[PDB]
């Protein structure tokens, strides 16, 4: 499963830049090494700082501050499409920021047949005001009196003797 | 690529201003409130634009725009409204009502008849005799040359040797019955002026008196 990492990095000190500025970004990787690799790729593509000239000063896994409070997250991403340039924004509702990112990644691989390679997550934001929620499906979820029948109940011991109830 | 209602498009080049038109109506309402006198509240009725044109002629300006939009621009609360005691006036201010500047006697007396509109009650029990069609209930000394109207009627009418003929007696309208859209449209081809334009002069929002009565 994914885990959220804050990675702080900078280029090597030298006479040209005795005290290079720290550059920190939060990025989602399944492990430590992927987080560092994604950090270097991001910093190279954005700021034009070479991998060799830099070094990581801090990497820290961040847990969810409230892993039991139902929250709604909005995710801005830059999808690499057939033209290599496309922007998106999707809404999600769950309890952990990593969960929203993981659900977003599966959503990308489904509705756009995307990779981990082509996805670049701009910003994941917690949205708390109800009227600031845009998407229709999540908004209708926010109504107070939610209730619905168990969707897709679907329920070795081959050759069962009686016809399944498959209902209540 | 998606199932949706196809939208018809034309080339009128007469699209309304929308928000700007609403602002223009509000400005006209404010100017009408700032007009000299006669403080009328009556704009339109079931009559056609000819009655409105005649009414506008006998004045030196009847206009309402969107109903309750002028009241909203003025404001129901007396604080927003420039007039006095407009809180009760706004409740009465509804429908086709607008200011004017030219009166009471002409509105009370001069009421021209006009073709009826749907929903009203027929002034009589009109009956269409069978055989050749009578446009004016047999007042011609109403020809039978209504070649296209036979196809445009839909009612029990067939074309016999180029003459429209109602096979059975078809009662056009009966007194005390609500005027349906089909009944009103059928009566439009005849001379049924079963209507009378009225006006409303319950009160006058005078500049000094500020007494808009509810009469």
């Amino acid at each position: 499963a994914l885990k959220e990492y804050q990675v702080v990095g900078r280029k090597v000190p030298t006479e040209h830049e005795p005290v290079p500025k720290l550059f920190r970004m939060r990025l989602f990787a399944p492990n430590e090494s992927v987080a560092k690799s994604r950090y270097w790729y991001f910093l190279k593509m954005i700021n034009k700082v070479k991998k060799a000239t830099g070094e990581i000063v801090a990497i820290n896994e961040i847990s969810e501050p409230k892993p039991l409070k139902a929250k709604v997250f909005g995710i801005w991403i830059r999808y690499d499409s057939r033209s290599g340039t496309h922007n998106m924004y999707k809404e999600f509702r769950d309890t952990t920021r990593v969960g929203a990112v993981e659900a977003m990644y599966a959503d990308m691989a489904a509705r756009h047949r995307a990779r981990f390679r082509s996805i670049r997550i701009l910003k994941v934001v917690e949205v708390e005001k109800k009227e600031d929620v845009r998407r229709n499906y999540v908004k209708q979820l926010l109504n107070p009196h939610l209730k619905f029948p168990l969707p897709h109940r679907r329920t070795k011991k081959v050759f069962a003797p009686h016809r399944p109830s498959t209902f209540y | 690529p998606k199932s949706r209602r196809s939208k018809v498009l034309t080339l009128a080049q007469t699209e309304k201003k929308g928000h700007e038109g609403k602002a223009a109506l509000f400005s006209g309402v404010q100017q009408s409130l700032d007009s000299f006198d006669y403080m009328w509240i009556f704009d339109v009725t079931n009559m056609r634009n000819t009655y409105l044109k005649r009414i506008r002629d006998d004045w030196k300006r009847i206009f309402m725009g969107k109903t309750k939009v002028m009241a909203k621009a003025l404001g129901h609360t007396p604080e927003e409204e420039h007039a006095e005691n407009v809180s009760k006036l706004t409740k009465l201010l509804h429908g086709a009502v607008g200011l004017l500047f030219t009166v009471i006697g002409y509105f009370e007396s001069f009421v021209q008849n006009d073709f009826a509109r749907a929903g009203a009650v027929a002034p009589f029990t009109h009956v269409i005799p069978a055989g050749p069609v009578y446009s004016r209930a047999g007042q011609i000394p109403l020809t039978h040359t209504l070649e296209p109207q036979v196809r445009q009627l839909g009612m029990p009418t067939v074309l016999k040797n180029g003459v429209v003929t109602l096979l059975a007696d078809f009662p056009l309208c009966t007194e005390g019955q609500q005027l349906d859209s089909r009944q009103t449209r059928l009566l439009k081809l005849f001379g049924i002026t079963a209507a009378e334009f009225k006006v409303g002069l319950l009160g006058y929002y005078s500049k000094k008196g500020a007494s808009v009565e509810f009469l």
Binding site: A70, R93, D94, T95, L141, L146, F148, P149, Y168 | -
Partner: protein, 125 residues
Amino acid sequence: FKRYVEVGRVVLVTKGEYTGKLAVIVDIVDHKRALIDSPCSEFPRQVIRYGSVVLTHIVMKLPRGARSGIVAKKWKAQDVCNKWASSAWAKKLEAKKVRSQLNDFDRFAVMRLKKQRREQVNVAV
């Protein structure tokens, strides 16, 4: 119907390590996940899916997103337990559990009594 995914419905966990336990839905995260909690100490408040639960017939009033203490207090006040167990459904489950724990000697105890039970076969002529 008879089973609605309601905030305040108690559900019977059918998957995971908490199989057989009784929890109550506190919140609806989304179409496929709900937040559940139980006053029983061993069972922690957590987010569970719907393939891992079965809906019961008991609906108890409980405000949205109540904390663990409030849920336990409402559960105790409305007598959720001993209301679930009052049903013949729970009795069937408890019968199955205790019958699973019977050893060989108890099985022979079951042997003897139900043979005594069987031989009654008294019917009106």
